[PDB]
Write a protein that binds this ligand. Sequence first.
Ligand SMILES: COc1ccc2nc(C)c(O[C@@H]3C[C@H]4C(=O)N[C@]5(C(=O)NS(=O)(=O)C6(C)CC6)C[C@H]5/C=C\CCCCC[C@H](NC(=O)O[C@@H]5CCC[C@H]5F)C(=O)N4C3)nc2c1
Ligand SMILES: [Zn+2]
Length: 197
Amino acid sequence: SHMASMKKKGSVVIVGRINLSGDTAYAQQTRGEEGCQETSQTGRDKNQVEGEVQIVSTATQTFLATSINGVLWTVYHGAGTRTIASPKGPVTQMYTNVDKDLVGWQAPQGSRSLTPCTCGSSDLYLVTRHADVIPVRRRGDSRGSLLSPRPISYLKGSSGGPLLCPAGHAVGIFRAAVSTRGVAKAVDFIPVESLET
Ligand SMILES: COc1ccc2nc(C)c(O[C@@H]3C[C@H]4C(=O)N[C@]5(C(=O)NS(=O)(=O)C6(C)CC6)C[C@H]5/C=C\CCCCC[C@H](NC(=O)O[C@@H]5CCC[C@H]5F)C(=O)N4C3)nc2c1
Ligand SMILES: [Zn+2]
């Protein structure tokens, strides 16, 4: 029938991480494509989670998610209303605010949270899904300028990742980017004051 044939939307799945625990940032893959698709459909992820910044995927998109204040945060435009796969099955969001482009799930067991930044620094560092660390000069509360011209493609897929201060605290999570003739010029982020329940 029509209703028998209705497909169920799958879960966000953790497929990797951006390791920030030593003197060198680097990306790690923890699931390949077939395992991602299977875990999206079941909602059951028995991998052990580590760290603060996760690489996440749906059936159709990949982006980042960052734990702050005991919640794994990402962008609504990547995750929508989806559950996240976990060792106990799919986990429903505990925070959803489309108006901030923001969602959150309770942080996975075994993860760690970044500390909110209280520095008021304007020297920021954007962490990409390739573990590039991009200097950004803060312009107000939710925005920053890129110091050096990079093609916008270098930033695609990095929404949900952190902006860090010089001390490595979280200033916000990356939401959107502004470019001119293909060159990324500025970034827009969800400030950390909002990354709390
Ligand atoms: C559906 O419900 C909602 C609700 C709220 C909501 N809110 C916003 C802001 C929103 O924006 C969408 C998504 C976001 C995006 O692509 N995000 C990044 C990413 O990487 N995503 S991603 O991981 O590839 C992806 C797609 C998840 C997998 C970080 C960029 C990287 C590259 C940019 C590429 C070209 C696009 C340039 C856009 N620029 C822009 O909007 O600039 C704004 C307007 C001017 C000022 C500034 F704030 C931009 O960045 N966009 C446009 N969608 C929604 C949708
Ligand atoms: Zn700080």
